[PDB]
């Protein structure tokens, strides 16, 4: 889209938001949970998408 | 709050929405999954809260 932050009034970093639709965290249930490490929650929770 | 559906303009059944904040599926992860049955998805998916 040719969008570079802070290039224009509408592309200022304080005027950009992100919405994502997710309904599963299978990674946490199955793959990441076979060994819980320091990045379990940051890397598995849907909040971080 | 004394909210009876359909008894006033602002409480008509089609004018009421539900918003919920959830961030876990522990039942699905551990308890409901020990024996998957007919109500696994309807009973463990956050969409049904």
């Amino acid at each position: 889209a040719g969008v570079v932050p802070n290039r224009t009034s509408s592309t200022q970093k304080n005027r950009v938001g992100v919405w994502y639709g997710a309904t599963s965290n299978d990674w946490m249930e199955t793959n990441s949970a076979q060994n819980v490490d320091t990045y379990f929650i940051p890397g598995g929770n849907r909040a971080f998408i | 709050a004394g909210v009876v559906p359909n008894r006033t303009s602002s409480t008509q059944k089609n004018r009421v929405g539900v918003w919920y904040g959830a961030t876990s599926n522990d039942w699905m992860e551990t308890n409901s999954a020990q024996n998957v049955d007919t109500y696994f998805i309807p009973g463990g998916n956050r969409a049904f809260i």
Binding site: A1, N31, Q34 | Q34
Partner: peptide, 30 residues
């Protein structure tokens, strides 16, 4: 005017945590 140029040439690599030993079929057994 903005053209449709080729996407970034990412240096992709495989990062996977394989699900092993079929433990999902024994959820509750000793």
């Amino acid at each position: 005017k903005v053209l449709e140029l080729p996407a970034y040439g990412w240096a992709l690599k495989n990062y996977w945590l394989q699900y092993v030993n079929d433990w999902s079929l024994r959820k509750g057994d000793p």
